[PDB]
Ligand binder design. Structure first.
Ligand SMILES: Nc1ncnc2c1ncn2[C@@H]1O[C@H](COP(=O)(O)OP(=O)(O)NP(=O)(O)O)[C@@H](O)[C@H]1O
Ligand SMILES: CCCCCCCCCCCCCC(=O)O
Ligand SMILES: [Mg+2]
Length: 603
């Protein structure tokens, strides 16, 4: 019984109490051992699309557990609890067996990517120099790429490379449960590092978010209690496992023994119908869940055209997040798939970040998905005033409520004081899901994780937190709470501020998209760069798939006029490029800061 199992850690007041000895792996094994009679239950289906039709690999409860313990036992022949180990593989069952197997051995995994995928050499080099793992877990498909990545080092300095699907299951029988130290010094197991999450999309040197057993276990409990899950369920995901959103979701589902169906982002992008087909109702189905970034809604709405017989009525939650969720994308999806059983009320925009482990807010009322319209001028002055659709209005999507126990406060970053609901500020979070810091980065850790709330409102969203706490996490994200609902406006650092007015890229990007059918839907990056004595607005946009460069001139003129009229700024530059030329993350989403850097290095 899952719901009781997860409730054992809550108290009457809704507070979480974790025993000092609990770890992520200990929780996983506790649930597995309680799942008497569950060993033969189907738990994971992996789609290999080396061929176009694809071949499924299936694993039941027992097989997953055995693979995990085989990995752990092998690690215990060559390493100690606390050692770091990089995971360098494509999305695959081995990726998960390696990550969780490291946890079982008390090692600290570092989820990374297949190094043969382009665009990671600098990143991987920096991560390896930062975390310095002596061991790499990989699979047979990726092992050559891994061996080559390290071929410029002295052989004696290369990490040991372990290919998980070369390990026999006879290893599992020698796995040993790590025992806690008795010392004096001793950090409790629950407070030890669980894994290191290096995020992507930034041009700066990678920083390792240190997630502890406490961090993750707390967020797993917060997620479970807030998501109002219908069990049993299956979760469909193609998210990259080296992304915060991908790996925690897969681990959440695996630790609870629920059903998980996985492919790689490239499989979705090349044939989005594969994803819609996976959400289609199957005979055994009870509840189906999915988690995607915003752009995927537009891609599927256009390119996963539905057939007679498609039945999406089993989809109980379509979580959308990791980037601004747009009205345009939500409605295109709802309109395309609503006639085939997709309940619009089950679209659930949500917000989080690695520094909070995974999830900060998600809809916890029936009022979702929320779309609200705000006066653009007031918004540019940090005030949210609800207006009627389509009269100088900015459409923003509600991402729900904080997942307790946890506080979410809107804070003036200049004065570090709470602001009233309806006032735009920086989101600050407080709770035991927060990460411990950035690995070996004391000042960056202090800036992001060790903030003090200098002042609060009479009715404070910080209620329950000691007034002197120095543990507020400043997200770097701007937003506002209106009528109890959180809205994300943009990243603080990437605000477009021109002549004393704040402009939000997502707002500008809608104007650009809407300004001409020459532009590929949702394929716009708007950002500011420093000019002579002011900030310049730069706009990059791909022309749609069927369009010729001869239409660029017209689209540019139309984009310029539309943006000037709606926002009162004449773009300094409007560049139109070919489809897929705008740089994107491994998940497929536009990587704005990476594009901005590339533009500056071309001037
Ligand atoms: N629903 C959302 N709406 C708008 N933005 C979101 C949403 N969900 C996540 N984000 C943004 O994604 C961020 C969290 O992404 P994360 O996976 O932690 O790495 P990252 O911030 O993109 N890269 P880095 O600069 O290295 O930290 C938040 O801080 C938001 O900026
Ligand atoms: C069974 C599925 C329910 C799980 C819902 C929690 C997932 C929410 C994802 C939030 C994404 C933002 C994280 C990020 O961008 O780093
Ligand atoms: Mg960040």
């Amino acid at each position: 019984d899952l719901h009781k199992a997860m409730g054992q850690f809550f108290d009457a007041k809704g507070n979480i109490a974790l025993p000092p000895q609990i770890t992520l792996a200990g929780l996983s094994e506790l649930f597995y051992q309680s799942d008497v009679d569950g060993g033969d239950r189907h738990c994971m289906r992996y789609w290999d699309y080396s061929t176009e039709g694809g071949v499924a690999r299936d694993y039941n409860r027992r097989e997953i557990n055995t693979r995990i313990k085989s990995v752990a036992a092998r690690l215990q022949q060559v390493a100690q609890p606390g050692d770091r180990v990089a995971i360098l593989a494509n999305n695959s069952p081995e990726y998960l067996f390696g990550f969780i197997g490291a946890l079982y051995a008390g090692l600290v995994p570092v989820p990374l990517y297949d190094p043969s995928e382009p665009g990671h050499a600098d990143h991987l080099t920096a991560v390896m120099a930062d975390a310095q793992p002596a061991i790499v877990l990989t699979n047979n498909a990726s092992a050559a790429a891994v061996r080559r990545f390290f071929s410029a080092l002295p052989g004696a300095q290369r990490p040991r490379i372990i290919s998980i699907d070369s390990l026999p299951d006879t290893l599992a029988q020698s796995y040993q449960i790590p025992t806690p130290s008795m010392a004096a010094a001793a950090i409790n197991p629950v407070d030890l590092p669980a894994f290191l999450q290096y995020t992507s999309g930034s041009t700066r040197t990678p920083a390792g978010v240190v997630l502890t057993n406490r961090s993750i276990v707390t967020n797993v409990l917060q997620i479970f209690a807030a998501a109002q899950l219908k069990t049993p369920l299956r979760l469909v995901s193609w998210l990259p496992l080296h992304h915060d959103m991908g790996i925690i979701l897969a681990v959440f589902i695996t630790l609870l023994g629920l059903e998980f169906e996985m492919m790689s982002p490239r499989d979705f992008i090349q044939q989005p119908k594969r994803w819609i087909d996976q959400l289609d109702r199957r005979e055994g189905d009870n509840a189906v869940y999915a988690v995607v970034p915003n752009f995927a809604l537009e891609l599927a709405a256009r390119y996963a055209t539905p057939s007679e017989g498609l039945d999406l009525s089993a989809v109980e939650g379509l979580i959308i997040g990791s980037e601004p969720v747009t009205e345009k994308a939500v409605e295109a999806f709802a309109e395309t798939f609503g006639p085939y059983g997709l309940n619009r009320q089950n679209m659930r925009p949500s917000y989080g970040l690695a520094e909070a482990s995974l999830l900060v807010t998600t809809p916890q009322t029936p009022q979702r998905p929320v779309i609200s319209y705000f006066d653009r001028e007031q918004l540019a002055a940090n005030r949210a005033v609800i207006v009627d659709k389509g009269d100088n209005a900015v459409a923003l999507t509600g991402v729900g409520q904080v997942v307790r126990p946890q506080n979410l406060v809107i804070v003036d970053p200049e004065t570090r004081t709470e602001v009233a609901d309806g006032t735009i500020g920086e989101l600050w979070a407080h709770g035991e899901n927060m990460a411990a810091g950035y690995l070996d980065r004391p000042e960056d850790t202090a800036e992001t994780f060790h903030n003090t709330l200098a002042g609060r409102l009479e009715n404070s969203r910080a209620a329950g937190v000691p007034e002197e706490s120095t543990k507020w996490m400043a997200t770097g994200d701007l937003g506002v709470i209106v009528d109890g609902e959180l809205y994300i406006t943009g990243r603080l650092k990437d605000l477009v501020i021109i002549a004393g007015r704040n402009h939000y890229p997502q707002d500008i990007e809608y104007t650009v998209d809407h300004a001409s059918e020459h532009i590929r839907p949702a394929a716009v990056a708007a950002f500011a760069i420093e000019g002579d004595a002011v900030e310049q607005l730069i706009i990059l946009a791909e022309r749609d798939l069927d369009r010729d460069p001869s239409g660029d001139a017209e689209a540019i003129d139309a984009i310029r006029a539309a943006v000037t009229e709606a926002h009162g700024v004449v773009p300094a530059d409007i560049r139109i490029v070919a489809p897929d030329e705008i740089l994107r993350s491994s998940s497929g989403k536009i990587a704005r800061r990476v594009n901005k850097k590339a533009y500056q290095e071309s001037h």
